[PDB]
């Protein structure tokens, strides 16, 4: 009997909640958490206060689900990325995984998000455990993939899978907290150039 | 002199807080066991230090600078004859002075959560980044790393050797994990030097 009325209200607050992290990933993707309030972010999304407080106890819940949101997107557009290069090897693939992270952390929507409100708000902790539950599978096949055609040598793939991305983060911080990107950008692609060129077998 | 008598407290609350929040974290025991382990009063205690947080930028400091002491103690003793051996000898020292269990849990574990994102960094640029860049700048002169700017490659190799502390620090088996790290940093630096 009560099966359509579940449906519609779990409907219409899924569509509520849609509109709020969309909301709240435009004006903070170009302003900075710190600069939007939630209410801004209820009118943007056309959404009531009391919508806005239903979904989310407060501000910061609200970032962490747009931070959701934001890094299935980076890793969706960097599998593109990948798949589009026309790489011929795994070694290649990882060329172009590595060129991918600079080209999709390089949005300014993504810089101002996830490389620097995201480690703010989330607090340390919070932003390692999103960042490795998005990217070591990823970084895990790639690394599988490569030692599989005799391009990387045969090792546990965790604890390189989880070095190299702890300097593939950092790599993307020093370009987003530079006052000449451009400039910071060729130097840390140079830098990763040699890292991968000294690992890799082809 | 007040000055000496205030330097004493201060002596005792920041050895007390190091020792207890070294063995079972900083979460885990409040500023009344640590003034009660110190010898000193609450009173004594707050007009020197805010609030926990405020001790514990305190322990940081000294932590760090042991953290120094001991990695330019054992690269020194490392025999290291080339610029590119200290950079080796770096990367082992670090295993061995980020293994110590009071540098895992306050350096590693805690600090990160209690200063903040910002705050842990700046201490550990301050403490860090001397060292770091004399090794890569050696190196470079030498013709054993690439030409290129330092600051670059520095934050690169931090964020590769801070990320496999962390791993060792929670690993099932450390001893195990600590093996494995220490071959892919190894094998990571090896592919850009020359010698
Ligand atoms: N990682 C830290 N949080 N602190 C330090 N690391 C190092 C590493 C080498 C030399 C001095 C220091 S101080
Ligand atoms: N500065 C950091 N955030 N961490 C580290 N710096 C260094 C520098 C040299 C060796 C190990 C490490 S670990």
Known sequence: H????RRTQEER?????EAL????????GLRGYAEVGTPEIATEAGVTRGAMYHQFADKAALFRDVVEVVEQDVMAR????????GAATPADAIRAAVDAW?????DPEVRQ????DAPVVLGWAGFRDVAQRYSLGMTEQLITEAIRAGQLARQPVRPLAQVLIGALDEAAMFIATADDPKRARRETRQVLRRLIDGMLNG
């Not at 600079?102 to 390089?106: A, D, Q, R």
């Not at 998000?113 to 620097?116: E, G, K, N, S, V």
Request: aromatic fraction near 2%; proline fraction near 0%; charged fraction near 20%.
């Open 113 to 116: 998000l996830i490389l620097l």
């Open 21 to 28: 992290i969309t909301g709240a990933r435009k004006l903070w």
């Open 102 to 106: 600079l080209e999709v952390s390089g």
């Open 2 to 5: 009560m099966e359509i009325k």
């Open 78 to 85: 960097m599998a593109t990325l990948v798949a589009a290069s």
């Open 13 to 17: 607050s899924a569509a509520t909640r």
